[PDB]
Amino acid sequence: GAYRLKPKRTIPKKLGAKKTGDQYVIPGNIIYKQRGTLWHPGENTI
Amino acid sequence: GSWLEPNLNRKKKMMKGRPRVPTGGSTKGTTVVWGDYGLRMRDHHRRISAQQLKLAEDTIKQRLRGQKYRLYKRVACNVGVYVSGNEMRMGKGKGSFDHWATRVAVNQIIFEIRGQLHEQVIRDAFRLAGHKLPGLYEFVKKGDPPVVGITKLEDGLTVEDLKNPRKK
RNA sequence: AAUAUUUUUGU
RNA sequence: GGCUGAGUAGCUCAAAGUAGAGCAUACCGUUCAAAACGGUAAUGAAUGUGUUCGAUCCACAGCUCAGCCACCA
RNA sequence: AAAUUAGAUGUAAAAAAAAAAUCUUAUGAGGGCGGAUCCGCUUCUAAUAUUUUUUUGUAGUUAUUAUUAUAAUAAUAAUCAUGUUUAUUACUUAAAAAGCUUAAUGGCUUAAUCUUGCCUUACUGUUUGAUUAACAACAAAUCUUACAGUCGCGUAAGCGGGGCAUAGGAUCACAAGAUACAAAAAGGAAAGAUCUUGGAUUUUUGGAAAAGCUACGCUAGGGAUAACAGGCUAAUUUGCGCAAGAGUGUACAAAAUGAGUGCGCGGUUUGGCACCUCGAUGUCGGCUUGACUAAUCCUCAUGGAUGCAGAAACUAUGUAGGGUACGACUGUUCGUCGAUUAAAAAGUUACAUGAGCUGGGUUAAAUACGUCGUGAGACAGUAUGGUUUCUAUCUUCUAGAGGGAAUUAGAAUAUAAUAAGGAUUAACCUUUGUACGAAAGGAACAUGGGGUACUAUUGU
RNA sequence: AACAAAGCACUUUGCAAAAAGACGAUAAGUCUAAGUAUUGAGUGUGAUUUCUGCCCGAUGCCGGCUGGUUAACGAAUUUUCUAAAUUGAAAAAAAAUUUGGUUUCAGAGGAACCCCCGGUUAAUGGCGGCCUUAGCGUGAGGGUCCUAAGGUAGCGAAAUGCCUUGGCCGUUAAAUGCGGUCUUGCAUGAAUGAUGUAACGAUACAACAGCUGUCUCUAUGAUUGACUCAGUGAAAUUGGAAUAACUGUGCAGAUACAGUUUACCUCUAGUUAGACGAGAAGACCCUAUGCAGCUUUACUGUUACUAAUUAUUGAAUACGAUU
RNA sequence: CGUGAAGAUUUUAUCGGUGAGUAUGUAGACUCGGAAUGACAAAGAUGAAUCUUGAAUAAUCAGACAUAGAAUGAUAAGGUUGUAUGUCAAAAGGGAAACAGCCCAGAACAAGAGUUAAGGUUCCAAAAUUAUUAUUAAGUGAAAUAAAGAAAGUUUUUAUAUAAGUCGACAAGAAGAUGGGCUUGGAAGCAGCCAUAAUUUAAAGAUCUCGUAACAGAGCACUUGUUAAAUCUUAAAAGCAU
RNA sequence: AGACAACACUGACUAGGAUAGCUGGUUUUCUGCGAAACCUAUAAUAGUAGGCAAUUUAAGUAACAUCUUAGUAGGUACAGA
Ligand SMILES: [K+]
Ligand SMILES: [K+]
Ligand SMILES: [K+]
Ligand SMILES: [K+]
Ligand SMILES: [K+]
Ligand SMILES: [K+]
Ligand SMILES: [K+]
Ligand SMILES: [K+]
Ligand SMILES: [K+]
Ligand SMILES: [K+]
Ligand SMILES: [K+]
Ligand SMILES: [K+]
Ligand SMILES: [K+]
Ligand SMILES: [K+]
Ligand SMILES: [K+]
Ligand SMILES: [K+]
Ligand SMILES: [Mg+2]
Ligand SMILES: [Mg+2]
Ligand SMILES: [Mg+2]
Ligand SMILES: [Mg+2]
Ligand SMILES: [Mg+2]
Ligand SMILES: [Mg+2]
Ligand SMILES: [Mg+2]
Ligand SMILES: [Mg+2]
Ligand SMILES: [Mg+2]
Ligand SMILES: [Mg+2]
Ligand SMILES: [Mg+2]
Ligand SMILES: [Mg+2]
Ligand SMILES: [Mg+2]
Ligand SMILES: [Mg+2]
Ligand SMILES: [Mg+2]
Ligand SMILES: [Mg+2]
Ligand SMILES: [Mg+2]
Ligand SMILES: [Mg+2]
Ligand SMILES: [Mg+2]
Ligand SMILES: [Mg+2]
Ligand SMILES: [Mg+2]
Ligand SMILES: [Mg+2]
Ligand SMILES: [Mg+2]
Ligand SMILES: [Mg+2]
Ligand SMILES: [Mg+2]
Ligand SMILES: [Mg+2]
Ligand SMILES: [Mg+2]
Ligand SMILES: [Mg+2]
Ligand SMILES: [Mg+2]
Ligand SMILES: [Mg+2]
Ligand SMILES: [Mg+2]
Ligand SMILES: [Mg+2]
Ligand SMILES: [Mg+2]
Ligand SMILES: [Mg+2]
Ligand SMILES: [Mg+2]
Ligand SMILES: [Mg+2]
Ligand SMILES: [Mg+2]
Ligand SMILES: [Mg+2]
Ligand SMILES: [Mg+2]
Ligand SMILES: [Mg+2]
Ligand SMILES: [Mg+2]
Ligand SMILES: [Mg+2]
């Protein structure tokens, strides 16, 4: 803060890769969280 | 703006920061590019203020007044220093604006001069400007090799010879 | 007969 | 040292789709002359920079500032 | 200066054929060999890609030029065109910006933007797998899957359980609909339960209906936390030094003087931190009594001084032995002032010293003034008054003793080397009115100033 | 210097059954008082001289309309469930009306406080800015803004003045003091009284004369303790101690650790530098969803007191309004 | 140039703006390029069960320091707040003179000139007065680096001078056109301003320090000669010292 | 004068009936294992709850740790303009 206090602590969003390459995944498993399309859906992904 | 007063806003505060410490073999800013001679900082990296650089120019002009020369400034005061009261207590935010400053790496040129004057007349000008600037300075000519860290690339020495693990 | 606005100054 | 509220015609004071009304001033006329008086006119939003379709107005930083707090050992 | 409209990249559009090689793929040959479609090795074939690769071909049509006998051949130029030329189609046109519900960030131009048509899945119930097991727990959350039901759009594939993404608080109580569960003797009902839904600065937003004083204050606790002092630090200071030299000095930087600066010492100020002490480290001045430092006020030796004639003084180097007094004012440290003086300088020691004293100030209870507060009361605002404890155990210390170990058997008397302390000031006259100086003024070196006794010396 | 005080002023009390005021788990009743408006109670001020100004807006109290509001009361209304009857449905059926019981909604009129009007300052309280000028100057004068009213008389570096040791004069050889005066008063002021004398004061400040050991600067003397011998015989205190100096170190100030130095063993009388000496689980400061008293336009409450009405409790004219 | 005031039209090594640059620098909210480390998962191997689950069931929620890198402060704090690693806390022992946090090393108990780590080996005090080559002369220093800076301290290295006499000293010379022009009361090399191609010489600046009111005068740059060195001149850099 | 009301008065003494998230204390031996001072919530910050996670001893393990080989995510130092 400063002369006027202003608490600034947001809940972590934990964006990024949740599964690396050659990692086993079943339907529904989140692979990559992101704001916008940094990575686009490919084969057998939604 | 100018080299001592930039076109920046004093409201937006800047962190303290640290001067550039080239650890990869960078000769960036260690040579004379415009003038015939230069003034090199040869001791340690610092953060020179706009008041210490203004007095250096005034000290060179006073010594070379009435003569034909061209003084080049290779540093810009683009770092706003914010100071909180030395009588205040810790906390309660960041301090207010104090002055503009510039961070200089080691073995970097500060001033460069080009004129129809004698070399020894320029040495006395750069010698007086060094006694009033923070740190130690050196007289540099044009054509001499650059400096990687604190070692000059003299006698065929290259940046790859300094990166070679074997030197003995 | 019982009526009544104001109107300074001049080496 | 630390916060707050103010700044517009020469002088007063009023007011995000406006800058108004007085006094003063000026011209003329009334008087022997002047004042008062009567008639008819001209006078402004500090200092920048932003916001907004548009800013006396909202926001921000300076100048002028005034006012308040500087308590317990 | 600022209104509307029209513009702001280039390329391609008759058409290829063939040889080998380097991989990579194949739900190709059900290849072969070890263990049809499982797996590691495997040749062949096919396809994409890659070599700058070996090339071959680049016409036809219209027209021109040249040759040959209107045609043939060669070269050159144009050539998307059976199509409303406003052609059309494919590809290309950095980045930023615009737009996409609101800040910022990321993303979208091949759609998440825009236009239009039809629509209202901004659906009901249940449910999958995740958020490297959401928020380093739980809960309120977020994304996604499938089945059933029945709707929209689309030729179709298929898409749709709101919006490009990331910022809207429960329960209880209350209110409106549904379910047919239970109904305190029984038939009903009431009041309940399940499902859906609404009204919240519950903003201290995991969710109490909530103003002050205490110096008359109390208890439990804290060096987990301030005031005093110590410690760390050294911005700063009322403490200093060195380097450089603008400038002042009639001249001439460094006799004196030294802008704005740089490199440091020091631990004496105001601070910063909060390390020691809150089952207790008494505090500003004064008195008493010290000890120490030396950055020197006086006294002693001495360098420099166009600016050292003398005298006095300035500056600097040695040097801390001694001294640095008296009084008025103020609680005052400090400071101002009076009058003397050779001079009337400072600092450290718990800003030395209150189990040594004092208590004027600061800081309790009382009371008043002013100011502030609705008030109780408060005030680095000011006043008058206001309990200052302790028989010294130990160390150190000041004095005096009992005992003892000495070259040694023990004594009396007188004593050395040696050690520890003590004493420690300054001025004047003579010299001499000499040196110096125009004058005024005025030194230094040296001698004496012990005697109205001796002695010495000067006069008569 | 506070309290009281004589004096001064305002409010209150008519006594016909209880004067007001005080007291009474709460009354009878008591003081007031065997008093009566020149009485009693309450409040402020604090003899006397000279005086006590402006503002009733805010707050409080008091008075006032055939007024508004107006709880209880109440004209006029409106339901839930259930039983019976009627009606309807009479298909697997409710539903509606009436009455009994039960349980809700509902307000024309209608008190005080309040709204409204007025009064009261020796009631609680409040009593302002800006520019302009006869020349520089000064500002009589002239401009304007606002308020319920703008601090009047007087006092004024004060028990009040931060700046500040304010300027000047007297006092002192030297005046941050005291006294007088000027006053542009951070932040004087009129019964929270303003202001000047006589008299009074173990109040506070300042000066003079005299006086003195207060001091320059101490000395001597006396008694009782202190000291020794004989007798009697405590206390706080104490983890245990064979309990030195310096520098450094370290929970950051060492008798006890490191290094070096110094010191034969043991008492007596002195002295208080240290043992962060002893004494009191720090009054300061902070903490605890700890306390106590006090305060108020804190939250939630109880009362004094005020207002209306059923009951105890019955009439009569009216006058009049609802209609 | 020009009109009754107007403005019009050319220039600049002046200020601002615009375009270009494969120009120079700058970086918490620039990253076209780009590590190591760390993270995730797969197979294999190794290893001290260190892992997960079931059942049963705690304490802790005042942390400190070192190192690296930051924010904050002042590029101060034994400061405050994150991150990475370790120790302390809860860890004794050896070293750092003494020592919570540092360098080593994890104490079940004894024996041994046992073997080693950090660290050390003249004496206190266990072990070298052990070998090799240089530097220092200051007790610098030797287990807590005081700075810039000065200087015929000393050593090394790299240049460079020398019997064509280096270096130092000494002797003489150091001219003339010409008191350059200007300025000034006066300016003659030497207050100040402008110029400073020449000439003649063994060499000599229209002048580097003194001197004069101004001349005069004394020195310097520079030139010759004498004396005299057979590892011996001058300067710089670096190392250790003052 | 918060003055006095018999050690006590901003409300006495005595009998009866408390709490204290605070401070202090908690007594024999051997043996095995062995933390934390962090996150989240809290009228909550010197308290407490849930986690991470210490312990006991059963069942599991394609467990866990580490290296090797191949692969993936992400833009720091550096470097650059
Ligand atoms: K649409
Ligand atoms: K029933
Ligand atoms: K008294
Ligand atoms: K002797
Ligand atoms: K009174
Ligand atoms: K009085
Ligand atoms: K009034
Ligand atoms: K009134
Ligand atoms: K009396
Ligand atoms: K301690
Ligand atoms: K003592
Ligand atoms: K030494
Ligand atoms: K607690
Ligand atoms: K054990
Ligand atoms: K263990
Ligand atoms: K990149
Ligand atoms: Mg907020
Ligand atoms: Mg310097
Ligand atoms: Mg006349
Ligand atoms: Mg959209
Ligand atoms: Mg989780
Ligand atoms: Mg909360
Ligand atoms: Mg939450
Ligand atoms: Mg008091
Ligand atoms: Mg502490
Ligand atoms: Mg001399
Ligand atoms: Mg002596
Ligand atoms: Mg003291
Ligand atoms: Mg003492
Ligand atoms: Mg004793
Ligand atoms: Mg003497
Ligand atoms: Mg005689
Ligand atoms: Mg009176
Ligand atoms: Mg009565
Ligand atoms: Mg009055
Ligand atoms: Mg009235
Ligand atoms: Mg009723
Ligand atoms: Mg009503
Ligand atoms: Mg009515
Ligand atoms: Mg007055
Ligand atoms: Mg009054
Ligand atoms: Mg006795
Ligand atoms: Mg010590
Ligand atoms: Mg011992
Ligand atoms: Mg004594
Ligand atoms: Mg002790
Ligand atoms: Mg710390
Ligand atoms: Mg701390
Ligand atoms: Mg602990
Ligand atoms: Mg250890
Ligand atoms: Mg040692
Ligand atoms: Mg051995
Ligand atoms: Mg030995
Ligand atoms: Mg001349
Ligand atoms: Mg009191
Ligand atoms: Mg009392
Ligand atoms: Mg830990
Ligand atoms: Mg709560």
Coordinates of N, CA and C (backbone and C1' of nucleotides) in Angstrom, one line a residue, chain E residues 118-165:
Chain E
rC118 P -37.2 -13.0 -41.5 O5' -37.2 -14.4 -40.7 C5' -37.6 -15.6 -41.4 C4' -37.1 -16.8 -40.7 C3' -37.5 -17.0 -39.2 O3' -38.8 -17.5 -39.1 C1' -35.2 -17.4 -39.4
rC119 P -39.5 -17.5 -37.6 O5' -38.6 -18.4 -36.7 C5' -38.6 -18.3 -35.3 C4' -37.4 -18.8 -34.7 C3' -37.3 -18.7 -33.2 O3' -37.9 -19.7 -32.5 C1' -35.2 -18.0 -34.2
rU120 P -38.8 -19.4 -31.2 O5' -37.7 -19.2 -30.0 C5' -36.7 -20.2 -29.8 C4' -35.7 -19.8 -28.7 C3' -36.3 -19.4 -27.4 O3' -35.4 -19.7 -26.3 C1' -35.2 -17.5 -28.3
rU121 P -35.3 -21.2 -25.8 O5' -33.7 -21.4 -25.5 C5' -33.2 -22.5 -24.8 C4' -31.7 -22.6 -24.9 C3' -31.1 -22.1 -26.2 O3' -29.8 -21.5 -25.9 C1' -30.6 -24.4 -25.9
rA122 P -29.6 -19.9 -25.9 O5' -30.0 -19.5 -24.4 C5' -29.2 -20.0 -23.3 C4' -29.5 -19.4 -22.0 C3' -31.0 -19.5 -21.6 O3' -31.1 -19.7 -20.2 C1' -30.3 -17.2 -21.7
rC123 P -32.4 -20.4 -19.6 O5' -31.9 -22.0 -19.4 C5' -31.8 -22.8 -20.6 C4' -33.1 -23.5 -20.9 C3' -33.5 -24.6 -20.0 O3' -34.1 -24.2 -18.7 C1' -33.9 -25.2 -22.2
rU124 P -33.5 -24.8 -17.3 O5' -34.2 -26.2 -17.1 C5' -35.6 -26.2 -16.7 C4' -36.1 -27.6 -16.5 C3' -35.2 -28.6 -15.8 O3' -35.2 -28.5 -14.4 C1' -36.0 -29.6 -17.8
rG125 P -33.9 -28.7 -13.5 O5' -33.8 -30.3 -13.4 C5' -34.7 -31.0 -12.8 C4' -34.5 -32.5 -13.0 C3' -33.1 -33.0 -12.7 O3' -32.9 -33.3 -11.3 C1' -33.8 -33.9 -14.8
rU126 P -31.5 -33.0 -10.6 O5' -30.6 -34.2 -11.1 C5' -31.0 -35.5 -10.7 C4' -30.3 -36.5 -11.6 C3' -28.8 -36.5 -11.6 O3' -28.2 -37.2 -10.5 C1' -29.6 -36.6 -13.9
rU127 P -26.8 -36.8 -10.0 O5' -25.8 -37.2 -11.2 C5' -25.7 -38.5 -11.7 C4' -24.9 -38.6 -13.0 C3' -23.5 -38.1 -12.9 O3' -22.6 -39.0 -12.4 C1' -24.6 -37.2 -14.9
rU128 P -21.1 -38.5 -11.9 O5' -20.2 -38.6 -13.2 C5' -20.1 -39.8 -14.0 C4' -19.2 -39.6 -15.1 C3' -17.8 -39.0 -14.8 O3' -16.9 -40.0 -14.4 C1' -18.7 -37.8 -16.6
rG129 P -16.0 -39.8 -13.1 O5' -14.7 -39.0 -13.8 C5' -14.0 -39.5 -14.9 C4' -13.4 -38.5 -15.7 C3' -12.4 -37.6 -14.9 O3' -11.2 -38.2 -14.6 C1' -13.8 -36.2 -16.2
rA130 P -10.2 -37.5 -13.5 O5' -9.8 -36.1 -14.2 C5' -9.2 -35.1 -13.4 C4' -9.2 -33.8 -14.2 C3' -8.7 -32.6 -13.4 O3' -7.3 -32.4 -13.3 C1' -10.7 -32.0 -14.6
rU131 P -6.6 -32.0 -12.0 O5' -6.7 -30.4 -11.9 C5' -6.1 -29.7 -13.0 C4' -6.8 -28.3 -13.0 C3' -6.6 -27.4 -11.8 O3' -5.3 -26.8 -11.8 C1' -8.8 -27.4 -12.4
rU132 P -4.2 -27.2 -10.7 O5' -3.6 -28.5 -11.2 C5' -2.5 -29.1 -10.5 C4' -2.6 -30.6 -10.7 C3' -1.7 -31.5 -9.8 O3' -2.3 -32.7 -9.5 C1' -1.0 -31.8 -12.0
rA133 P -2.7 -33.1 -8.0 O5' -3.8 -32.0 -7.6 C5' -4.8 -31.6 -8.4 C4' -6.2 -31.7 -7.8 C3' -6.4 -30.9 -6.5 O3' -7.7 -30.4 -6.5 C1' -6.8 -33.2 -6.1
rA134 P -8.2 -29.3 -5.4 O5' -7.8 -27.9 -6.1 C5' -7.8 -27.8 -7.5 C4' -8.0 -26.3 -7.9 C3' -7.7 -25.3 -6.9 O3' -6.3 -25.0 -6.7 C1' -9.7 -24.8 -7.9
rC135 P -5.6 -25.0 -5.3 O5' -6.0 -23.6 -4.7 C5' -5.7 -22.4 -5.3 C4' -6.4 -21.2 -4.7 C3' -6.2 -21.2 -3.1 O3' -5.0 -20.6 -2.7 C1' -8.5 -20.7 -3.8
rA136 P -4.4 -21.0 -1.3 O5' -3.3 -22.1 -1.6 C5' -3.6 -23.3 -2.3 C4' -2.8 -24.5 -1.7 C3' -3.2 -24.9 -0.3 O3' -3.0 -26.3 -0.1 C1' -0.9 -24.2 -0.4
rA137 P -4.3 -27.2 -0.3 O5' -5.2 -26.9 0.9 C5' -6.6 -27.1 0.8 C4' -7.2 -27.6 2.1 C3' -8.7 -27.7 2.1 O3' -9.1 -29.0 1.6 C1' -8.1 -26.6 4.1
rC138 P -10.2 -29.0 0.4 O5' -11.6 -28.8 1.2 C5' -12.0 -29.6 2.2 C4' -13.1 -29.0 3.0 C3' -14.3 -28.3 2.2 O3' -15.2 -29.3 1.7 C1' -13.6 -26.9 3.9
rA139 P -15.9 -29.1 0.3 O5' -16.7 -27.8 0.4 C5' -17.8 -27.8 1.3 C4' -18.4 -26.4 1.5 C3' -18.8 -25.6 0.3 O3' -20.1 -26.0 -0.2 C1' -17.6 -24.2 1.7
rA140 P -20.3 -26.0 -1.8 O5' -20.5 -24.4 -2.1 C5' -21.6 -23.7 -1.5 C4' -21.5 -22.2 -1.8 C3' -21.4 -21.8 -3.2 O3' -22.6 -21.8 -3.9 C1' -19.8 -20.6 -1.9
rA141 P -22.6 -22.1 -5.5 O5' -21.2 -21.5 -6.0 C5' -20.8 -21.7 -7.3 C4' -19.5 -21.0 -7.6 C3' -18.9 -21.2 -8.9 O3' -19.4 -20.3 -9.9 C1' -17.2 -21.5 -7.3
rU142 P -19.9 -21.0 -11.3 O5' -18.6 -21.2 -12.1 C5' -17.7 -20.1 -12.4 C4' -16.4 -20.6 -13.1 C3' -16.6 -21.6 -14.2 O3' -17.0 -20.9 -15.4 C1' -15.0 -22.4 -12.8
rC143 P -18.1 -21.6 -16.4 O5' -17.2 -22.7 -17.2 C5' -16.2 -22.3 -18.0 C4' -15.3 -23.4 -18.4 C3' -15.9 -24.6 -19.1 O3' -16.2 -24.4 -20.5 C1' -14.5 -25.4 -17.4
rU144 P -17.5 -25.0 -21.1 O5' -17.3 -26.5 -21.2 C5' -16.2 -27.1 -22.0 C4' -15.9 -28.5 -21.6 C3' -17.0 -29.5 -21.9 O3' -17.1 -29.9 -23.2 C1' -16.1 -29.8 -19.7
rU145 P -18.5 -30.5 -23.8 O5' -18.6 -32.0 -23.3 C5' -17.6 -32.9 -23.6 C4' -17.9 -34.2 -22.9 C3' -19.2 -34.9 -23.2 O3' -19.3 -35.6 -24.4 C1' -18.7 -35.0 -20.9
rA146 P -20.6 -35.6 -25.3 O5' -21.5 -36.7 -24.6 C5' -21.1 -38.0 -24.6 C4' -21.8 -38.9 -23.6 C3' -23.3 -38.9 -23.8 O3' -23.7 -39.9 -24.7 C1' -22.9 -38.4 -21.5
rC147 P -25.1 -39.6 -25.6 O5' -26.2 -40.1 -24.6 C5' -26.3 -41.4 -24.1 C4' -27.4 -41.6 -23.1 C3' -28.8 -41.0 -23.5 O3' -29.5 -41.9 -24.4 C1' -28.3 -40.3 -21.3
rA148 P -30.5 -41.3 -25.5 O5' -31.7 -40.8 -24.6 C5' -32.5 -41.7 -23.8 C4' -33.4 -41.0 -22.8 C3' -34.4 -40.0 -23.5 O3' -35.5 -40.6 -24.1 C1' -33.4 -39.1 -21.5
rG149 P -36.1 -39.9 -25.4 O5' -36.8 -38.6 -24.9 C5' -37.9 -38.6 -24.0 C4' -38.2 -37.3 -23.4 C3' -38.6 -36.2 -24.4 O3' -39.9 -36.3 -24.9 C1' -37.0 -35.4 -22.8
rU150 P -40.2 -36.1 -26.4 O5' -40.0 -34.5 -26.6 C5' -40.7 -33.6 -25.8 C4' -40.3 -32.1 -26.1 C3' -40.6 -31.7 -27.6 O3' -41.0 -30.4 -27.6 C1' -38.3 -31.5 -27.1
rC151 P -41.9 -29.8 -28.8 O5' -41.3 -28.5 -29.3 C5' -40.4 -28.4 -30.4 C4' -39.4 -27.2 -30.2 C3' -38.7 -26.8 -31.5 O3' -39.5 -26.0 -32.4 C1' -37.2 -27.0 -29.7
rG152 P -39.1 -26.0 -33.9 O5' -37.9 -25.0 -34.0 C5' -38.0 -23.7 -33.6 C4' -36.6 -23.0 -33.6 C3' -35.9 -23.1 -34.9 O3' -36.3 -22.2 -35.9 C1' -34.4 -23.6 -33.1
rC153 P -36.4 -22.6 -37.4 O5' -35.0 -22.5 -38.0 C5' -34.3 -21.3 -37.8 C4' -32.8 -21.4 -38.0 C3' -32.3 -22.2 -39.2 O3' -32.3 -21.4 -40.4 C1' -31.1 -23.0 -37.3
rG154 P -32.7 -22.1 -41.8 O5' -31.5 -23.0 -42.2 C5' -30.2 -22.4 -42.3 C4' -29.1 -23.5 -42.4 C3' -29.4 -24.6 -43.5 O3' -29.1 -24.2 -44.8 C1' -28.7 -25.6 -41.4
rU155 P -30.1 -24.6 -46.0 O5' -30.2 -26.2 -46.0 C5' -31.2 -26.9 -46.7 C4' -30.6 -28.1 -47.4 C3' -29.9 -29.1 -46.5 O3' -30.8 -30.0 -45.8 C1' -28.6 -28.7 -48.4
rA156 P -30.5 -30.3 -44.3 O5' -29.1 -31.0 -44.2 C5' -28.9 -32.2 -44.9 C4' -27.5 -32.6 -45.0 C3' -26.7 -32.7 -43.7 O3' -26.9 -34.0 -43.2 C1' -25.5 -31.3 -45.2
rA157 P -26.8 -34.2 -41.6 O5' -25.2 -34.1 -41.2 C5' -24.3 -34.9 -41.9 C4' -22.9 -34.4 -41.7 C3' -22.5 -34.2 -40.2 O3' -22.1 -35.3 -39.5 C1' -21.9 -32.3 -41.5
rG158 P -22.5 -35.6 -38.0 O5' -21.5 -34.7 -37.2 C5' -22.0 -33.9 -36.1 C4' -22.0 -32.4 -36.5 C3' -22.3 -31.4 -35.4 O3' -21.2 -31.2 -34.6 C1' -23.5 -30.9 -37.4
rC159 P -21.4 -31.1 -33.0 O5' -21.9 -29.6 -32.8 C5' -21.2 -28.5 -33.2 C4' -21.9 -27.2 -33.2 C3' -22.7 -26.9 -31.9 O3' -21.8 -26.4 -30.9 C1' -24.1 -26.5 -33.7
rG160 P -22.0 -26.8 -29.4 O5' -23.2 -26.0 -28.8 C5' -23.3 -24.6 -28.9 C4' -24.6 -24.1 -28.7 C3' -25.4 -24.6 -27.4 O3' -25.0 -23.9 -26.2 C1' -26.8 -24.7 -29.3
rG161 P -24.8 -24.8 -24.9 O5' -26.2 -25.0 -24.3 C5' -27.0 -24.0 -23.9 C4' -27.4 -24.1 -22.4 C3' -26.2 -24.1 -21.5 O3' -26.6 -23.4 -20.3 C1' -27.4 -26.1 -21.3
rG162 P -25.7 -22.2 -19.8 O5' -25.7 -21.2 -21.0 C5' -24.9 -20.0 -21.1 C4' -25.2 -19.2 -22.3 C3' -24.2 -18.1 -22.7 O3' -23.0 -18.6 -23.3 C1' -26.4 -17.3 -22.8
rG163 P -21.6 -17.9 -22.9 O5' -21.6 -16.5 -23.7 C5' -22.0 -16.4 -25.1 C4' -22.2 -15.0 -25.5 C3' -20.9 -14.2 -25.6 O3' -21.0 -13.2 -26.6 C1' -22.4 -13.2 -24.0
rC164 P -20.0 -13.4 -27.9 O5' -18.6 -13.8 -27.3 C5' -17.5 -13.0 -27.4 C4' -16.2 -13.7 -26.9 C3' -16.0 -13.7 -25.5 O3' -16.8 -14.6 -24.7 C1' -14.0 -13.2 -26.6
rA165 P -17.1 -14.3 -23.2 O5' -15.7 -14.5 -22.4 C5' -15.1 -15.8 -22.4 C4' -13.7 -15.8 -21.8 C3' -13.6 -15.2 -20.4 O3' -14.0 -16.1 -19.4 C1' -11.9 -14.4 -21.8

